[PDB]
Amino acid sequence: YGRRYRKMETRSKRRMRPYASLGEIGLENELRKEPRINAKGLNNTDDEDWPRHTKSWGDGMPSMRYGS
Amino acid sequence: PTLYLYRFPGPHGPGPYTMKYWWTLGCFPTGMEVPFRLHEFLSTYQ
Amino acid sequence: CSMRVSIYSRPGKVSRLNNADATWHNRSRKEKPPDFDPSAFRRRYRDS
Amino acid sequence: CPSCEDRGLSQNSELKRFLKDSPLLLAEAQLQPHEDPGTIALRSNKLVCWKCRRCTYEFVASVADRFLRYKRCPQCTGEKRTPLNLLS
Amino acid sequence: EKQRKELDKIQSGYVTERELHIGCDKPLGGNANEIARVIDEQALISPTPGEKCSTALRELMENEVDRRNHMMDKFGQPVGAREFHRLFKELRHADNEAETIERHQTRLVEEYGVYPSLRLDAYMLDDDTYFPEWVNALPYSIRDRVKFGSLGLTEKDEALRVTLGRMPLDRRRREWERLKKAKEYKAAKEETLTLAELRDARQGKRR
Amino acid sequence: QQSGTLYIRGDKSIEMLRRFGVLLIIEEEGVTYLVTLPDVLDKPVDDTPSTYTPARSLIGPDGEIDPRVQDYIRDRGLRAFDLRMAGSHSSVERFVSAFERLERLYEVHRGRAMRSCVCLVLSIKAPKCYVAEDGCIVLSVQQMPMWEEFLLSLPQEVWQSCVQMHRDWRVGNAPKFHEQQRQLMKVADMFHFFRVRLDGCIGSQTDWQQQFILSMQKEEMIVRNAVKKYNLKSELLKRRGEICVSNTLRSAVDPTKEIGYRIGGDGRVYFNHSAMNTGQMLRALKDNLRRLETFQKQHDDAVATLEHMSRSIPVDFSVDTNWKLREEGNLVSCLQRFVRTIKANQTQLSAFLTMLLKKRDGAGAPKKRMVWIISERFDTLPSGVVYIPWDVDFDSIKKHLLP
Amino acid sequence: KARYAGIDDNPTITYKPWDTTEPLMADYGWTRGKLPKFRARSPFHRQQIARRMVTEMIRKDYCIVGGARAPALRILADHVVELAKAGDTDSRQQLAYFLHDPLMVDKAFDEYPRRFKDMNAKYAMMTRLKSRRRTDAVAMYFVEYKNRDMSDNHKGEDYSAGPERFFLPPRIVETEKGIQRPPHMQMAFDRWASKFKTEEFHHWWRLRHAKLRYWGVRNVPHPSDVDPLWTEKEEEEWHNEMLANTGEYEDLDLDDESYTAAGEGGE
Amino acid sequence: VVYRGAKMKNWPEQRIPENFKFTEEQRFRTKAIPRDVGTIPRNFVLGVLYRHQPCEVGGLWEHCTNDPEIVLDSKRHLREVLKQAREEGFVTFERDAISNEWLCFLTRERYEEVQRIVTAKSERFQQREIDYLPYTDLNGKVNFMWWYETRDVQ
Amino acid sequence: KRIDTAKRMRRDRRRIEELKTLEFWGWYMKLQRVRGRWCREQGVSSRGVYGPAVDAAELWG
Amino acid sequence: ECRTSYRFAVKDEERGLYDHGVTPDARTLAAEAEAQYRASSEFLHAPAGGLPAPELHMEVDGTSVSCIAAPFGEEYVPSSKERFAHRGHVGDLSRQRTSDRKYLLDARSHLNIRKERQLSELLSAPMPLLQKSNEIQQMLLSDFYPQNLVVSSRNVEAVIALWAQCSLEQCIAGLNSQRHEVDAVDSVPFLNHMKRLYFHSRQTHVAPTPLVLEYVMTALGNVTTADS
RNA sequence: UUAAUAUUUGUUUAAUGAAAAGUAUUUUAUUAUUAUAUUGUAUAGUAUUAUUAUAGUGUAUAGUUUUUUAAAAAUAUAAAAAUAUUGUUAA
Ligand SMILES: [Zn+2]
């Protein structure tokens, strides 16, 4: 039909609905860490929201898209 | 029943895109070409 | 053939076959349990 | 049978303060003779060797956990996994 | 609006006329205490505005996963070997997962006496004291279901849990006891069907 | 016979105690011994007062030892308790009687009164039973009939406090102890040493420990600039160095007399926070630096040779702490001479020693690996210990073991 | 057509300066009333890019970005400076919501008031570099805050060239080498830089290089050919250089003083 | 022999004119800073409540004023500490039937802990200045760290 | 043997991760303490450019 | 164990521990701050007599001023409980941490578990179908209903299965035996019993089972006439 | 010639609504230890998992099948409604 495989894959993999306000991102951060009643459930590690700048290796290494 | 040759020298001669492989990998990226370096061996070691 | 490409000897570089700074990355990150030893199990059970 | 005595099959009530007060648990008790003569505090937890009447299997269960909660023997309720308990 | 109306209707003693002084500092005197009573009542007893959330918000929270699953099922490229293997593994061990969560729940309720009523009360009050230590140590894939999977829960109940979590603790417990009494009376009255439920059953819509 | 009965009674008692789950430590003036080894690596799973786990998850019939309990014991510096080396017959009778008393005390009324997952310490020089600052309950071995009264009068609040302290200290994760060891590593990096640890801090106070940590973090710059100016950064000490600080340090010739510091033949450096200063410890390190690394190298060689001797010869080896302290560094030459003699006459050692195990037809408590303890002179106990001196000869050892 | 951000919650006694914007949520577009939308995969992706970009900008005081990201980053830095000048608890909560690093939130709210007390608007500064990115032939822009040397934790630093290593502190002009950074920022930067010297990091780095060589990117050396970034001798030398300090305090003469006491053995 | 003023170091005395008036829509938008929530205020209020319980909040403020050693900014700070105790589960609010007014009651679940706190706390000029500083935790929420500097001015 | 070794290794890994998280929390608390001390020394109040008068007014918070 | 020529300074177990890249003034400032905060916390936990406080005392202002630095962030909040931190209920986490568990304070469990195990034993008892069903009904109406004790889902499933089998066999027996003002629901031997037990289970909030609802549906189906 | 073309555009990034393996190849290196013939080694990739020889005290910083950027048109997305149309049921 003409739907590009790569673009449709990205669209179906990651979200598109943008945040509307900082109060809204705060409400979302509040309501996100909620347990699944009958769903699959995902790992809520004790550093999921904490700053990963010191955890992940590539968060400080020189970058071209961010320019050092 | 077909063979796959990734990057092979053309009809006129081997180009830089294959000499890069010849100098880094050691032979052409197809493997069907036998590495023959007698000339440079004679030019350097002998 | 990456080992023969890089770690092996060439007319430009020395042999890295026995070189810790070039071989240390081959070890696995996540440690794994040791494999079962059939000879050890035989010498331990000692069937009668 | 001892199993039908606790339920009301066939007003005044008293308080049981020792193992000897309960005649049901005293029968199944395989308690050691030198350790305790039967003056075990029924509310306190203490491990004593029992012996079921049905399977005649010896095990170790607490006195407080046996009386207050009516714990069943591991062979008759499915923990010891014996041929009498196995399904196959 | 309500606070202004009631505070203006309160006209016991406005002698000091120091409402702003008492709002920016301590009180003026102990005699004119009606304004102080009203201010403290509306500051503590009166709930914070906007704490109550609607079930539409909780549904929109999972609308993201709903849209992702719909888009994947509509425009899904056939999976590879590893994805096929993961899907088959999950589909095969779903029954084992159900069996092990049932075993965890029955072990909990038989060795600790934490019955489903207590588990639902803990869910609503957002309190983890009702569960032993290993409950939070259980695998994350089943840690959330082992606690509140047996007892029935609705989207309205989840929204009410969020509302309770937002509201103060004493109000949490009081409103939760009131709603629990209401739910028990509903369960006693649920012998028959109402007109709305009959219409929904005839239509086929599932709330 | 009677000793064997005492030993089997003690083993039964400590096994019942580890099934109950408490951690038993006998604290002496010199060093503490861990008697009962419960499931310390197991994370706490339940908060109930009574827990009974008959299985032994740490020790198994196949492995017989876990590679993690060694680290757990080394991180605290606790010695291994053994009934055959406990002391005289009356002393071991008193010890096994105390163990049986504690086992019976738990068994009769175990529950909320005497909670599980708690650390108990046995002290000899203790006036009355009291709770330590750490969270472990220490009891005097002299007050035998008062243990019941003390443990039953200890309120539930103090019991919960002791349980919490034992759970977040030396058990499972132990975050407080982990942060303490982290700060110890922080000061050890400044000292250019491998590990700095506190000893005798199990039943003692924690105020001096915290004050020591904070004072070292305060005066860290002084030691760093001093080692930079005096070239005190030794590679061997940095690779393997041991510093041990205690609340007090007692002399080797007179236990009542106290010394500023202690230098051992193995290389460890012992300090006392009572009479220690940033200048005193610095001067001691500067005076002993060009000697401690040599002692460490020689002691490492000697210990490796003794390990090979234990791998070949079935007998086990140990060293006497009193003689080690009295030598004051001169123990190295004696140990090297002993190692040389054993290596020269090694082939005949096992051949002669197997004859004793083959000729002892009946023993109350036999062991294939009899214990040898390096001492100053010849001694002998009814145990399976030899108390072999440093100066040895083959015929002398033969006649000392059996005519 | 309508922006729900206009629906005001918890209204203050005084109307906000913007009164219609977030102001962090920019509503990117192409008409002059909006910000230039840099090409992304979705508006959510655009907001995430802007968030990470402004976070890194606040962290390292400068950012080199290509394409239309520079005007967006500059306007967002302006809005962040406005929030810092406001200094309200709600403003701080909003900035902590919008940023990735609360430590950087605190750094901004601590340093920016004193930095821009004497400025009205246009706090950031964008400079178009003549050098373009090689992979895209796209222009690059250096965005940095103006008041660097008057009041800030960064002062007298050189941005003409990067340091010897990317985990070392930036170059410092010889005129202002005596200044010291705040202790918390220094310790945080040290904890960040410490991860690049571990052995696990080099293992992961060689694995990433192997993955790159397998994917087919050129001029990437072999994992058996790469070198460690910070050896023990380099670390010791740099620590000696940084710790050499004879100010306000000298060493204690242990040999000359009576500090020594009677010990057990040793001599 | 006086104990007057648990004020803040940076806060100066404000002068409000007598004819000052808020607008009908401006007076209900006042946002106060979050007062201290620390162990010192919570323990002081717990001790005052253990001395007087149950008592109206006005009576509680009067008792805190009569108490010589008081660590509290103002009645607003007392209300904030009461909110913290309410959320933690130390105090509850029950409405009387005759007066139709609310009243603070110590929670019977935490009564033993309140007793232990007051026992551990119980086992001349004064002036205390309160100084605060904002920060944000790892989760990304704003909170103020507080401290109290005491001095004897004569 | 495989299951026993797996359990023994996963226990250590879990305890290491938990200790890492706790140590990171403690380090961040130490960082906040140090920055509070430094702000007390430097006289910088992170409440905007205005100062203490607006706070004493406590209108905006 | 280190065959490499070079060695890595920091280890994976220590990141930000040694702090080698920190200016000495910042190092001593951090040490002094930590010492002051620890001393303040210790004084707060145990007040000294007369308040000496020589470490936290300050003489810079010219008068005797001691800054009692109150602690903060002592309570630990994981990222999985970030919702409580964002709402503001840190006291709730403090209570949930320092509060005794509810299963240690519940005393009705000692009785409920006992009655549940007795019901399991009664189910395991090898009795005839009708007599066992009557005995279970008697025991239930005597012990569980007057005390609304929680019944396990599997026990409910088993007892409803037994009741369905008994209803079927008793219908067959009544047909063989045959070979007014009575409601239609009274024809089934245990329809009302199943209904009351299922509603008691719904009230006590135990999860029903597909087999449970299947047996109840069959008991509703084997009915003579149509009933609202 | 088509061709200044069509489709592609990938160096830590917006990290992911998530994480416990087996099997067959390719490539090989001085591993340690129990310490008695021979035999096949480790990590890393690649292909596969219905048709039971992979599911438990609790799961690898896991991001190549995840892919760049300062325009309109074409095209895709009705999970792109704060439209409209039709049909079904219900008051
Ligand atoms: Zn039985």
Q: Which parts of G18-160 are beta strand (E)?
A: 62-66, 124-132, 139-145, 157-158
Hey, which bits of F37-124 come out as E strands? 79-80, 119-123
Burial profile E171-199: b = 16 or more Cβ within 10 angstroms, e = fewer: bbbebbeeeeeeeeeebeeeeeeeeeeee
Interchain pair D70, J139: CB under 8 A: no
Burial J167-188 (b: 16+ CB within 10 A, else e): bbebeeeeeeeeeeeeeeeeeb
Q: Is F287 exposed, middle or buried (0-12, 13-18, 19+ CB in 10 A)?
A: middle
Return the DSSP state at D42.
Answer: S
Backbone angles phi, psi at G140, to 5 degrees: -110, 150
Whether G58 contacts G98, CB under 8 Å: no
Answer for the pair I11, G155: CB distance below 8 angstroms, yes or no.
Answer: no
Mutation choice for E interface testing from H25, H26, H27, H60 by most E CBs within 10 A:
H27
Q: Does residue C32 contact residue C23 with C-beta atoms inside 8 Å?
A: no
- Per residue, the 3-state secondary structure of J41-86, as one string, reads HHHHHCCCCCCCCCCCEECCCCCCEEEEECCCCCCCCCHHHHHHHH
Tokens of G53: 């970009």
State the Cα–Cα distance between residues D49 and D54, nearest whole angstrom: 16
Sequence-ordered list of residues with C-beta below 8 angstroms from that of E52, at least 6 positions apart, any chain: E163, E166
Beta-strand (E) ranges in G69-163? 124-132, 139-145, 157-158
Q: Which bases of strand K sit closer than 7 A to a protein CB?
A: 7-22, 26-30, 32, 34-37, 42-45, 47-50, 54-72, 75-80, 82, 89-90
**CA–CA dist B31, B8 (Å, integer):** 10
Cβ contact F129:F33 at 8 Å = no
Give the closest residue to J105 by CA, choosing from G37, E25, F48.
F48
Test H139 with A51 for CB contact under 8 angstroms: no
Annotated binding-site positions of D: 1, 4, 52, 55, 73, 76
d(CA G121, CA G79): 10
| A36 touching G (Cβ < 8 Å) | no
Query: Which among J87, J153, J206 has CB closest to E166?
Result: J87
Contact J126, J181 (CB under 8 A): no
Binding residues of D for Zn(2+): 1, 4, 52, 55, 73, 76
Indicate the length of chain J as a whole number. Answer: 228
F174: alpha, beta or left, given left = phi > 0 and alpha = psi -120 to 50? Answer: left
Angle between helices E155-166 and E169-189 (to 10 degrees): 160
* Residue E188 host element (H or E): helix E169-189
The DSSP symbol for G170 reads: P
Q: Is the CB of E128 under 7 A from strand K?
A: no
Residues of chain C with C-beta less than 8 angstroms from the C-beta of J5: 20-21
- Give the neighbours of chain I: at least 3 Cβ pairs within 8 Å: A, C, F, G, H, J
Q: What is the DSSP string of E83-112?
A: HHHHHHHHHHHHHHHHHHHHHHHHHHHHHT
Contacts (Cβ under 8 Å, ≥6 apart) of G144: G61, G62, G63, G124, G125, G127, G159
Residue F156 parent element (H or E)? helix F156-167
CA to C1' distance (Å), from J187 to K61: 68
With the CA atoms of F195, F201, F207 and F212 taken in that order, what torsion angle do they form, in degrees rounded to the nearest 10?
A: -20
From CA C28, how far away is CA G139, in angstroms rounded? Answer: 42
Q: Do G184 and I38 touch (CB under 8 A)?
A: yes
Residues in chain A with CB shorter than 8 Å from the CB of G204 are: 57
Resolution, given in Å to one decimal, reads 3.9
SS3 of residue F26 by DSSP: strand
Nearest Cα residue to F262 out of G105, B23, G266: G266
H88: left (phi over 0), alpha (psi -120 to 50) or beta: alpha
CB G227 within 8 A of CB G234: no
What element of type H or E holds A7? helix A5-13
CB contact under 8 A, H140 and G92: no
Say how far G208 CA is from K10 C1', in Å: 14
Q: Can you tell me which residue has the tokens 């050919």?
A: G225
SS in 3 state form for D50-79? EECCCCCCEEEEEHHHHHCCCCCCHHHHCC
In this structure, what token pair is assigned to residue H119?
């026992």
Q: Is I13 exposed, middle or buried (0-12, 13-18, 19+ CB in 10 A)?
A: exposed
Give the integer Cα–Cα distance in Å for G151 and I43.
Answer: 14
- Largest Cα–Cα distance of chain D, in whole Å? 48
Would you say I29 and I37 are in contact if contact means Cβ atoms under 8 Å apart?
no
Residue F271: what are its φ and ψ, rounded to 5°?
-125, 160
Helix axes of J153-178 and J191-204: crossing angle, nearest 10 degrees? 170
Q: Is the CB of A60 under 7 A from strand K?
A: no
Ligand 1 centre from D75 Cα, in Å? 5
Tokens of D60: 């170790």
> Closest residue of A to J85, CA-based?
A30
Question: Which residues in chain A are followed by a discontinuity, with C-to-N distance exceeding 2.5 angstroms?
Answer: none
Structure determination method: cryo-EM
Helix (H) or strand (E) holding E203: helix E195-203
The DSSP string of H90-119 is: SEEEEE-TTT--EEEEE-TTTHHHHHHHHH
Does any strand K atom come closer than 7 Å to the Cβ of A20?
no
Q: Please choose, from the candidates G226, G198, G201, the residue with its C-alpha nearest in 3D space to the C-alpha of residue G212.
A: G226
Helix (H/G/I), strand (E/B), else coil: F177: helix
Taking CB atoms and an 8 Å cutoff, what residues of chain I touch G191?
A: 27
Where does residue G82 rank: exposed (0-12), middle (13-18), buried (19+ CB within 10 A)?
middle
- Work out the number of other CB atoms within 10 angstroms of the CB of residue G118: 10
- Compute, in angstroms, the gap from residue F51 CA to the centroid of ligand 1: 24
| CB atoms closer than 10 angstroms to residue E96 | 9
Of E150, E152, E160, E156, whose CA–CA distance to E124 is shortest?
E160
* Å separating the CA of residue G95 from the C1' of nucleotide K59: 35
Taking only residues 8 to 37 of chain B, the set having a beta carbon closer than 8 angstroms to any beta carbon of chain C reads 24-26
Can you tell me the distance from the alpha carbon of F119 to that of H104, in angstroms, rounded to the nearest whole number?
Answer: 41
CA distances from G83 to D18, G15, G105, I57 (A): 74, 15, 11, 20
Tokens of D74: 């591991």
User: DSSP label at J22?
Assistant: S
